[PDB]
RNA sequence: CGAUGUUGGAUCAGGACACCCAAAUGGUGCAACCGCUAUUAAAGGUUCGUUUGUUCAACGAUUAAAGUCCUACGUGAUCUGAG
């Protein structure tokens, strides 16, 4: 029985084509505007801070770098992640995952239902989400639980805060020990015979080996990296945006895996933010469409002038 | 680390990847059809999109003149470029050129070949791939599916 | 006579693959900005004055004034170049338009230069970069249509911060006879590329985009 | 950027800035961790053969926005105990050096005009 | 560096024997519905694409033969014709090629 | 000795502690600052230049310090050939 391969274009005619683009695409949109109201079908019990609580996280998407101002003259630099349609998949209780904390899934910015394997779809039928992206697991504390299929804004964070930002790096392939490394070459034109950018030795005579943790040209970027720390500056409420201080690992319009941060000088920050998670049709009053921090220079100033 | 890279390296260098990217569009805007190495025809298609976009542009203006001069090595196709190829081209935006993968040639080098053509021209039509009729099972099946949603709206 | 439309440069995307979305707020910041601040129309070789908040100056303010070199970036991040010599001493400041700082921006002569780049008056001579501190303000009318100073320069001798004889700069604000030969020339001449004039790809064509940047800028001035 | 063996012009009017030598004053060292030295940075001098204590006062390189950038490497001589050795400085100087008023106090108040 | 020992055959087995160095099965290959000859999905039809190219070459010989010269590119439109056709009234004012051949069923005509 | 290719330098260093710095202490003929000794600790560091092929050595400017050694006096199928 030789199967041949197929995909969803092969027997679709030049009719069903925008038929079937169509009927997808509105499935799609009542399914995402389904998820609009969390907080009156079914939500699950809230539950009150705690010390020791932890919260969870966004996927949001690199959009570009940014300048922005202090009120005491300094400038910034600061990165745009954007929260496209961020939503929660799936719980798996603290016993069965870790034994400490519960794990929540986040799933990102959505895709095509016709690149996407049997399970996934399976998965993304019984939830009732379209198919995401990037799927990461945050390690919450179990009073800070959220209903699957809830979605996540932006203004789950709020202007001054200090989040947690893991991405994969720009991948620069097989590199070169002196790129990888950041090894001295030899020197340039005083004899040295094809030799300007090799490692040199690479162990010791006695040994008559390498050691394991020898730094040798190989893979260098596509790793999965954090960045510590970072503060937040201003929310975009109505694009969904975060002006998060620094640099963001990855490249532009990547998916980021956001949180709060993990340090110790941060821990206990979470109890002036939202807990469980951010509602928009709880509080039946509309966010400002940008919420800036306490130093940040506004567009519209009066031009900050010293005294 | 070849990171936001849009053209190909082609010839012994950009200058020799110009002509030949210029001898192809020569060929091209004189025959209405011609095949090619993948690659080649590859990039050779946006510069025959952008080289119809100069033809429309106009047989008077001097800047689009100039770029119709230096790109087509045979000056007896800047009038035909100028009167054929931009007339017939007016209503489109950019469907100006087909490419389609052929079979790889028959010598031994085995080389991944395409063929390019201006669209509605005097040769015999390439077998184009046809989609598959109405009349086939799943595309009735979808065909029903598509009245009954006409119906319930 | 009609009447033609400027906009200014760092309104312009890149040529890169970011999302439009942070070039719309990011124009949208900058409008914002541009409603307090009002940011005057000025090119290449334009005279400006700068007054900016020094925190240490004896007055709050300090004033700079000096010939616009360069304008380079993108969005709110647009910097443009002043350069002046004081007391036989060249100054070059590179300020930021959008900065908060800055106090106000005026326009003490409108003019254009044979050079989209001015980065050669650094090895020109003395005469050309020395400019009046305190000139008082050309005004300009519209039907000018912002004269083009036709200006040769001339040069210190070799060598220079670039080699501003090689046809990857493009220039024609220097007077090259007096200071090269026309076997200097010939050398110059062998790092000519000349289909890249032709090359057509390599073309950035921002009609669309132009049409949208203004479509919004109305919007907010209407707004 | 002002490191080792790097030719500099005295500003402030000494003898030693002044009197011609068939040397250019070079820097001999620079007094961060870094052998690199910006504004307001203290580094030694060799001026007619001898060795003396400046502060740079400009340079060439870029910096950051609203920072001038003059068109040679400045400095002022100092002595041992960080006072100048000039009476008045006639180039223009950053304003960003009144910030370290603790330190350069001496160095400011003979300074004249301001960039 | 010269090689220490004689590999083995059993070493040489495992390395030249190798999945990776193995040939792949092609799962796109299917029949021409036209001519019935195989083609793969993603590719145009040999039998066809030769089909084409023989005529077009006949075409070209044909317009290159109306030439006296390797410059003369017509400034108008082009149209061929089999014999038993005539130019309608939409052909008129081009330039016509005249083919003995009769109409080939593929080629349609337009 | 039917070949284990050499000093010094470049690149990369693994290790020991008999610790130069950084850390915790005991005694001082330890008033304080500088110091002199001894105990414990090896995760991390231990500069740039003139002369000399130089390892060393003298000298200039600094540093928290510019440690002693082993590794075929580490490392020439990675490099130089100044001796
Ligand atoms: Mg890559
Ligand atoms: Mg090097
Ligand atoms: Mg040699
Ligand atoms: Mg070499
Ligand atoms: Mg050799
Ligand atoms: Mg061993
Ligand atoms: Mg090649
Ligand atoms: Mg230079
Ligand atoms: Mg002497
Ligand atoms: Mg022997
Ligand atoms: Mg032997
Ligand atoms: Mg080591
Ligand atoms: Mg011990
Ligand atoms: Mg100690
Ligand atoms: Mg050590
Ligand atoms: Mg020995
Ligand atoms: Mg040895
Ligand atoms: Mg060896
Ligand atoms: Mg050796
Ligand atoms: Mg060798
Ligand atoms: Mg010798
Ligand atoms: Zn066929």
């Known amino acids: 029985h030789g199967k041949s391969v197929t995909w969803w274009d092969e027997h679709l005619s030049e009719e069903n084509v925008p038929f079937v683009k169509q009927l997808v695409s509105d499935e799609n949109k009542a399914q995402l505007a389904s998820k609009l109201c969390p907080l009156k079908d079914e939500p699950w019990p809230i539950h009150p801070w705690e010390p020791g609580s932890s919260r969870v996280g966004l996927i949001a998407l690199k959009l570009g770098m940014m300048p922005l101002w202090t009120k005491d003259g300094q400038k910034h630099v600061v990165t745009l992640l954007q929260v496209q349609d961020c939503h929660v998949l799936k719980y798996t209780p603290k016993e069965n995952h870790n034994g400490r904390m519960a794990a929540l899934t986040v799933g990102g910015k959505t895709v095509s239902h016709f690149?996407?394997?049997?399970?996934?779809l399976e998965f993304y039928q019984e939830l009732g989400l379209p198919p995401k992206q990037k799927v990461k697991i945050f390690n919450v504390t179990e009073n800070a639980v959220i209903k699957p299929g809830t979605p996540l804004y932006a203004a789950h964070f709020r202007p001054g805060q200090y989040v947690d930002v893991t991405a994969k790096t720009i991948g620069k392939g097989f590199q070169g020990v002196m790129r990888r490394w950041g090894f001295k070459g030899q020197p340039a034109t005083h004899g040295q015979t094809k030799?300007?950018?090799?490692?040199?030795?690479?162990?010791?005579?006695?040994?008559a080996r390498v050691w394991p943790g020898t730094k040798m040209p190989?893979?260098?970027?596509?790793?999965?990296?954090?960045a510590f720390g970072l503060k937040v500056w201003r929310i975009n409420t109505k694009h969904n945006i975060i002006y998060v201080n620094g640099s963001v690992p990855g490249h532009k319009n990547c998916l980021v895996k956001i949180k709060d941060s993990k340090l110790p000088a941060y821990k206990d920050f979470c109890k002036n933010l939202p807990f469980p998670t951010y509602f928009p049709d709880g509080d039946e009053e509309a966010l400002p469409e940008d919420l800036y921090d306490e130093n940040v220079c506004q567009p519209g100033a009066p031009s900050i002038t010293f005294t | 680390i070849s990171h936001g890279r849009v053209f190909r390296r082609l010839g012994l260098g950009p200058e020799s990847r110009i002509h030949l990217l210029q001898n192809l569009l020569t060929g091209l805007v004189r025959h209405e059809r011609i095949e090619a190495s993948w690659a080649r025809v590859d990039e050779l298609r946006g510069y025959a999109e952008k080289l119809i976009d100069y033809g429309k542009l106009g047989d008077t203006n001097e800047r689009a003149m100039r770029m119709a001069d230096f790109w087509l090595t045979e000056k007896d196709l800047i009038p035909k470029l100028f009167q054929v190829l931009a007339p017939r081209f007016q209503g489109q935006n950019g469907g100006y050129t087909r490419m389609?993968?052929?079979?790889?040639?028959?010598?031994?080098?085995?080389?991944?070949?395409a063929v390019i053509e201006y669209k509605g021209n005097c040769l015999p039509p390439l077998p184009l791939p046809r989609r598959d009729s109405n009349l086939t099972l799943?595309?009735?099946?979808?065909?029903?599916?598509?009245?009954?949603?006409?119906?319930?709206? | 006579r009609p009447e033609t439309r400027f906009l200014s440069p760092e309104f312009i995307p890149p040529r890169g693959r970011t999302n439009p979305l942070k070039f719309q707020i990011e124009r949208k910041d900058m409008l914002e900005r541009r409603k307090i601040l009002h940011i005057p129309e000025f090119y290449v070789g334009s005279i400006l004055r700068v007054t900016t908040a020094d925190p240490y100056a004896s007055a709050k303010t300090s004033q700079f004034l000096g010939i616009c070199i360069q304008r380079s970036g993108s969005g709110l991040g647009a910097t443009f170049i002043l350069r002046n010599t004081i007391e036989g001493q060249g100054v070059e400041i590179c300020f930021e338009l959008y900065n908060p700082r800055i106090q106000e921006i005026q326009v003490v002569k409108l003019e254009k230069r044979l050079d989209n780049s001015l980065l050669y008056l650094r090895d020109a001579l003395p005469e050309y970069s020395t400019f009046d501190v305190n000139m008082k303000p050309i005004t300009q009318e519209f039907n000018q249509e912002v004269p083009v100073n036709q200006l040769k320069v001339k040069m210190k001798p070799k060598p220079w911060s670039k080699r501003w004889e090689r046809p990857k700069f493009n220039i024609k604000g220097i007077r090259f006879d007096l200071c090269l030969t026309e076997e200097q020339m010939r050398e110059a001449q062998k790092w000519s590329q000349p289909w890249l004039e032709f090359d057509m790809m390599r073309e950035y064509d921002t009609s669309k985009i132009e049409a949208a940047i203004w479509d919004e800028i109305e919007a907010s001035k209407n707004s | 950027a002002i490191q080792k063996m790097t030719r500099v012009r005295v500003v402030d009017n000494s003898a030693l800035g002044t009197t011609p030598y068939h040397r250019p004053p070079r820097c001999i060292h620079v007094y961060n961790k870094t052998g690199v030295g910006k504004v307001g940075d203290r580094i030694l001098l060799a001026i007619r053969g001898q060795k003396k204590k400046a502060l740079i006062v400009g340079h060439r390189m870029p910096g950051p926005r609203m920072t001038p950038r003059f068109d040679s490497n400045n400095?002022?001589?100092?002595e041992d105990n960080g006072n100048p050795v000039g009476t008045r400085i006639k180039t223009p100087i950053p304003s960003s050096l009144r910030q370290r008023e603790g330190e350069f106090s001496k160095v400011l108040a003979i300074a004249q005009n301001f960039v | 560096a010269a090689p220490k020992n004689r590999r083995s055959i059993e070493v040489n087995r495992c390395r030249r024997r190798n999945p990776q160095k193995l040939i792949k099965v092609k799962n796109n290959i299917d029949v021409c519905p036209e001519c019935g000859h195989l083609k793969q999905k993603h590719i145009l039809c040999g039998y066809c694409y030769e089909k084409v190219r023989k005529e077009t070459a006949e075409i070209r010989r044909q317009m290159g033969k109306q030439e006296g010269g390797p410059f003369r590119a017509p400034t108008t439109e082009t149209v061929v014709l089999y014999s038993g056709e005539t130019p309608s009234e939409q052909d008129q004012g081009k330039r016509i090629i005249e083919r003995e051949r009769k109409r080939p069923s593929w080629f349609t005509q337009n």
């Open chain 1, 218 to 226: 190989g893979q260098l970027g596509n790793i999965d990296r954090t």
């Open chain 4, 75 to 78: 400095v002022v001589l100092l």
């Open chain 2, 138 to 153: 799943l595309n009735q099946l979808l065909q029903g599916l598509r009245q009954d949603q006409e119906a319930s709206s």
């Open chain 1, 195 to 207: 030799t300007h950018r090799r490692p040199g030795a690479i162990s010791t005579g006695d040994v």
């Open chain 2, 100 to 113: 389609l993968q052929i079979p790889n040639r028959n010598e031994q080098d085995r080389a991944k070949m």
């Open chain 1, 115 to 120: 690149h996407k394997s049997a399970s996934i």
